[PDB]
Each structure stands twice: as structure tokens, then as C-alpha cells.
């Protein structure tokens, strides 16, 4: 059934609303955490705890 005939295949698509909500949420949380840590490290900083 493979000697002479060929048909194409595709990659597995993830159309699930749960995992898409999870992916968009975690990527937004991670990029805003990275942005705020970068901006707090390269400027004047405060701290709730002593030398934190």
C-alpha cells in the first residue's frame, strides 16, 4: 500500500479552549513578571523586607 502511491500529512493541531487559555495566561504572566523584574533591577528599587 506504499510502493507507488503518496498522500500528505500535517502536524497535530491543538484546538482546545482550556489549553489555549492556559497558554495565553501563562505567557502573559511570564512576560509581565520578566518585564517588572528587569525594570526593578535596572533602576531605583524599594523592598517590603530588609535588603530584599
Amino acid at each position: 500500500p506504499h510502493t507507488y502511491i503518496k498522500t500528505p500529512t500535517y502536524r497535530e493541531p491543538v484546538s482546545d479552549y482550556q489549553v489555549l487559555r492556559e497558554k495565553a495566561a501563562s505567557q502573559r504572566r511570564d512576560v509581565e513578571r520578566a518585564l517588572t523584574r528587569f525594570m526593578a533591577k535596572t533602576g531605583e528599587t524599594q523592598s517590603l523586607f530588609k535588603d530584599d
Binding site: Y17, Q18, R21, E22, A24, A25, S26, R29
Partner: protein, 393 residues
């Protein structure tokens, strides 16, 4: 606000006569010696006393009084005579009462003498008993008139009784020596047949009469429903009467006072009443926002009895989350303005839940943190700052 302030410190005296008020640490002869809280409560009491004058003399006559004052002022405002006529633009108390007496023929001098010249609010303590033999309702209304902020009321008093035959108003004459007021009660033939019980408005509803007493027809009682005096009422109903008044009343102040009085009865019927109020659109939204906090307090008081999940969580996932994912909140669409306010007030009350160890449960804290993480506001036409601020709260 005013009964809290007047019972806290002395009282607000509209129209003093020149000290007239010596119970308070400043002089009321000039506006610049008044405390700022006294100035705020002064304006507040002034507009409530004007609502009382509208209650005695109807609203169209009141607007005619105001139009007569404005018309005298605007005929005065065009003259050139240096104040021969420019003082008709200045109102006084005697001129205001005279214009009221001109347009209506009634004078309000007892109402002015009680609520303006006298500086106090009244306190009502009511309790009822139903006489089954003579079919009467014996009310017992006593006043606390020896507190520092209080005064004694001797006028008439409206009371609204909802019985099975409908809603009936009664006027009671509360003289100084009065204590027991016997009002008559109607039939109970709407429990013989299942018929709908007619409400305060023209409509009628189906009520579950299993919680009601078998011998009494009366479903709830409200002392001074229209707020026609400056009063603080402490009525002693039964808990099922407070639940019926929360569910089937067509007055928002009675639903609010039943929410306020259901915190003393933590029975599961009251939890069912507040949960049915919370699920109910076509209830006024500020009643449901109060029922959130009342449900939180009741849930804290009946720990080691609570069966299922924490309070309002399943209701939040039923109202505001996705059907396929219960722990993922729906993307923000704030275009309804009543489920927006309820959505932003429900986790704030849900966070007041406490376990048997007095610590907030990790099921509600995790729920609030998932409400924070899965928040998506790229799709509504409104901002998210108040909802996120309430999430921090």
C-alpha cells in the same frame, strides 16, 4: 448616616435660635466654627426633613412652593432699586413656611417643631404577638427616649402587614403612655386553596408556605415602611418572616433590612433565601451585593455544618465562568453593569470565608488567584481597573 451620627454625638439642630446646642464641643452660631462632619450631617438632615415636608404636603405643591420662591426672586432680580426689592431674593424660614401655607392651606408647624427645632431622632423597639382567638395582631412598640441623641415621638405611625390575603396598611397613634396596639387580621383561605398571595404592588406570586405557622396568616410586618420619620427600627420577627420579606417583597429597603436581620439567624433556610436572592436577576443589584456579605457571615457561623463547597463558589462558576471549564473565568465583557458589579463584589465577600482553624480556605484563595491569572480584558469596551482593584481587595 444621620441616626448613626446623632446617636453618636448629641444631634444636628436645623434652625437654631440665638447656646441652643450645648451637647457638642463647638458653637453652631457661625458656619466657620462647625465641624466638617457636622456640616455634612447638617446638609443630609436638611434634605431628609424636606422629604418629610413633601410627605405631609404632596410633591406637586412642593414644586409649586419652589416655583413661587424662584418667581419672586426673578421678578426681584430685574429691578434696579437698591434692595427695595432685591431682598425678595433672600429666603427665610418664616417666608418659606408662609409660602407653604399659601400654596397648600396646611401649615407644617408640628412637623417643623419636631424635626427642625428639636434636634433628635427616634428609636423604635417593636415586637408582635398574634391572638388566634380574636384574630388580632398585638403590636408592642416602645421607644428609647433616654439615650443622649433621642427624642420622643407622639405622632401617627404607619405599619404594613403582609398577610395571606394581601398587604394592608394601618395607622397607629403612639401617644406617650401607649404600648400595645391591637390591629385586626384577615382570613387564611389562601392556604386552604393554593392561590397566589397578592403583594404590595398589584402583582401576586406563589409562596412556599411550609415554613409559615399554621395558626397565623401574617407573613411579615414592617414598622414605618415609607421612612416617614427620622427613625431607627428594631423589630423582632421570626426568621421565616425575614426570609419571606427577603424573597417576595417589592421594596428594596425591606430586602436590605431583612438581609441585615438574617445575620442573626444562621439556619439553612436563610442560606437558601440569600442564595435565591443572589441567583435572581430582576432583583435590585445592591441587594445582591449585600447578600454576598450576609452569605459570607452566615457561612462563617455554620462551620462544622456546611455540606458542600464554600459559599458562592459554585454560584460564581455557574454565573461568570465557562460551561466547559469551571475554574477558567470567562473573558471580561462588562456591558451589563449589574453582573459586572456582582462579579467584582462576589470574591471580595467570598474571601471572608474561614475554616474551623480560623484560616481562609485554600480553595477560595486558589479560586481568587485563578480569577487573577485568567483575566483577559482585550475584548470589552470598558476598562478593568476597578475589577482588578477589587481582586486585590
Amino acid at each position: 448616616k444621620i441616626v448613626a451620627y446623632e446617636l453618636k454625638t448629641g444631634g444636628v439642630l436645623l434652625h437654631p435660635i440665638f447656646n441652643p446646642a450645648s451637647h457638642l464641643h463647638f458653637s453652631i452660631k457661625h458656619p466657620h466654627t462647625l465641624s466638617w462632619e457636622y456640616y455634612s450631617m447638617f446638609q443630609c438632615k436638611a434634605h431628609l426633613v424636606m422629604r418629610l415636608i413633601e410627605n405631609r404636603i404632596s410633591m406637586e405643591f412642593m414644586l409649586q412652593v419652589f416655583n413661587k420662591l424662584l418667581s419672586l426672586a426673578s421678578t426681584a432680580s430685574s429691578q434696579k432699586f437698591q434692595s427695595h426689592m432685591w431682598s425678595q431674593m433672600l429666603v427665610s424660614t418664616s417666608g418659606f413656611l408662609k409660602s407653604i401655607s399659601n400654596v397648600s392651606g396646611k401649615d407644617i408647624q408640628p412637623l417643623i417643631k419636631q424635626w427642625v427645632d428639636q434636634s433628635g431622632v427616634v428609636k423604635f423597639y417593636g415586637s408582635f404577638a398574634f391572638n388566634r382567638k380574636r384574630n388580632v395582631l398585638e403590636l408592642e412598640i416602645k421607644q428609647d427616649y433616654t439615650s443622649p441623641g433621642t427624642q420622643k415621638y407622639v405622632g401617627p405611625l404607619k405599619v404594613t402587614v403582609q398577610e395571606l390575603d394581601g398587604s394592608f396598611n394601618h395607622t397607629l397613634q403612639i401617644e406617650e403612655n401607649s404600648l400595645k396596639h391591637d390591629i385586626p387580621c384577615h382570613s387564611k383561605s389562601r392556604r386552604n386553596k393554593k392561590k397566589k398571595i397578592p403583594l404590595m404592588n398589584g402583582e401576586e406570586v406563589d409562596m412556599d408556605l411550609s415554613a409559615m405557622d399554621a395558626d397565623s396568616p401574617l407573613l411579615w410586618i414592617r414598622i414605618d415602611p415609607d421612612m416617614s420619620v427620622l427613625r431607627k427600627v428594631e423589630f423582632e420577627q421570626a426568621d421565616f418572616m425575614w426570609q419571606y420579606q427577603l424573597r417576595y417583597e417589592r421594596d428594596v429597603v425591606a430586602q436590605q433590612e431583612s438581609i441585615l436581620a438574617l445575620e442573626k439567624f444562621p439556619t439553612p433556610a436563610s442560606r437558601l433565601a440569600l442564595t435565591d436572592i443572589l441567583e435572581q436577576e430582576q432583583c435590585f443589584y445592591r441587594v445582591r451585593m449585600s447578600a454576598c456579605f450576609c452569605l459570607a457571615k452566615i457561612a462563617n457561623s455554620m462551620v462544622s455544618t456546611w455540606t458542600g463547597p464554600p459559599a458562592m463558589k459554585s454560584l460564581f462558576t455557574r454565573m461568570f465562568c465557562c460551561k466547559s471549564c469551571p475554574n477558567i473565568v470567562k473573558t471580561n465583557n462588562f456591558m451589563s453593569f449589574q453582573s459586572y458589579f456582582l462579579q467584582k463584589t462576589m470574591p471580595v465577600a467570598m474571601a471572608l470565608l474561614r475554616d474551623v482553624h480560623n484560616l481562609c480556605p485554600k480553595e477560595v484563595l486558589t479560586f481568587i488567584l485563578d480569577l487573577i491569572k485568567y483575566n483577559d480584558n482585550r475584548k470589552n469596551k470598558f476598562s478593568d481597573n476597578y475589577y482588578r482593584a477589587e481582586m486585590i481587595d
